[PDB]
Each structure stands twice: as C-alpha cells, then as structure tokens.
C-alpha cells in the first residue's frame, strides 16, 4: 500500500544516482578518448616522418 | 590493553594496522566505552555475529565528548580480529538483518579490494529499507540502506572513519583484460 511510495522514493534516488554516475563516466570517457586521440596523432606522424625522410 | 590489540595472525590493511584506519582518539574513546568494556570483550568472529544482530542503528561518534555508537565499536572489533571474507560476504548477502548487512558493508569498504567493494556493495543499491541513524549531535535521523551504500561509495568519511581511497569503477574496468 503506502510503501509503494517508498519504492517510488527509491526510484527517484536511484535515478539521481544514475544521472550522477553517468555524467562522471562520460567525463572520464571523453578524457580517455582525448588522450588516445593524441597518442594516435603522435604515432601517425612518427610513421609519416619515417616514410618521408 | 592486550585484549584490545589487533590479533596475532592479522596482516596489514592499506599498508597499516587495520585498527589505525580509525582515528587515535576515536579508538581511545571506544576502548573506554561502556559498550566496548561490556559487550566487546573477546576476540572471536561469533561475538561480532551475536552483537551485530543486536544493533538498532548506524552511526559513528556523537557529542562534544566524542562517544562511540555500538555500530562503530563493532566495526573496530572487526578491524582488530580481521574476520575472513566469507563471513563479511555473508553479513552483506544476508537479507534478514539490515544493520548486520550495513556493518559488513562498511567493513568491506574499509578493508576490501576495489573489485570486491563494487561487487558486493553495488547490488545493495536495491535495498531501500528504512534505517535508524545517529548523527554527530546524538540526534536520530531516518535514512535508507541504499543511501548508506551511496555514502560508502562516494563519501570521504562515513561513521567518523576516513574511507581509504577507492578507484572509480570505470578505471578498474578499463584496467580489466
């Protein structure tokens, strides 16, 4: 009965938790992607240098 | 004083004596307490089982005299005797006693591997049962299990213990093979 609203109150808490964890996760995803992009850029330029000279 | 020392067989946790995860003055206030002197005499995991089932609330210390709650006393006792992972996991998995569950959870958060922390604490997010919480003032507040679990996984301090640094799950996953 009334504890159905206790389950509802939990849902909301869990959704706040999910939103927060999702934002942190994306922020760190974006960082790792950036690092890796730089690493790839470096490797491509290294190979380019060797072919060139 | 000897009965308050960390058991002979115990290994180090987070580079130190497991009891030292709790502040020096907090330990001292625990050893001095009525609850510890009467209810925590003994070095056995079964003691912890029996007393844990008698827990009515979560908390750390309260008052400007820094008095320990039973919850915190049992936590120190657990650091001191270093029970085996099986019992802690049983504490956690048990569905009948919420305070036992939370006691096992805090201990897992304090002493477990990053992996074990997520593995065993995260499913407890489903547990939304009401719990009694004694704040720093000595006031009793309503709380919910999953909120305690969230505090264990995202706070610096719970029950007046500074939580050992815990890697974010995404980093441990990116570390996975």
UniProtKB/Swiss-Prot annotation, chain A:
Record's subcellular location: Nucleus
Entry's family note: Belongs to the MFAP1 family.
Quaternary data: Component of the spliceosome B complex. Interacts with PRPF38A (via N-terminal interaction domain).
Functional note: Involved in pre-mRNA splicing as a component of the spliceosome.
Protein name, as recorded: Microfibrillar-associated protein 1
Organism: Homo sapiens (Human)
Source organism phylogeny: Eukaryota, Metazoa, Chordata, Craniata, Vertebrata
Entire protein: shown range: 270 to 322 of 439
UniProtKB/Swiss-Prot annotation, chain B:
Location of the protein in the cell: Nucleus
Chain segments carrying region N-terminal protein interaction domain: 2-177
Modification Phosphoserine, positions: 12
GO cellular component terms, A-Z: nucleoplasm; nucleus; precatalytic spliceosome; U2-type precatalytic spliceosome
Record key words, sorted: Coiled coil, mRNA processing, mRNA splicing, Nucleus, Phosphoprotein, Spliceosome
GO terms of molecular function: RNA binding
UniProt record, GO biological process: mRNA splicing, via spliceosome
Subunit structure: Component of the spliceosome B complex. Interacts (via N-terminal interaction domain) with ZMAT2 and MFAP1.
Protein family membership: Belongs to the PRP38 family.
Summary of the function given for this chain in its UniProt record: Involved in pre-mRNA splicing as a component of the spliceosome.
Protein name: Pre-mRNA-splicing factor 38A
Organism of origin: Homo sapiens (Human)
Segment of the intact protein contained: 1 to 176 of 312
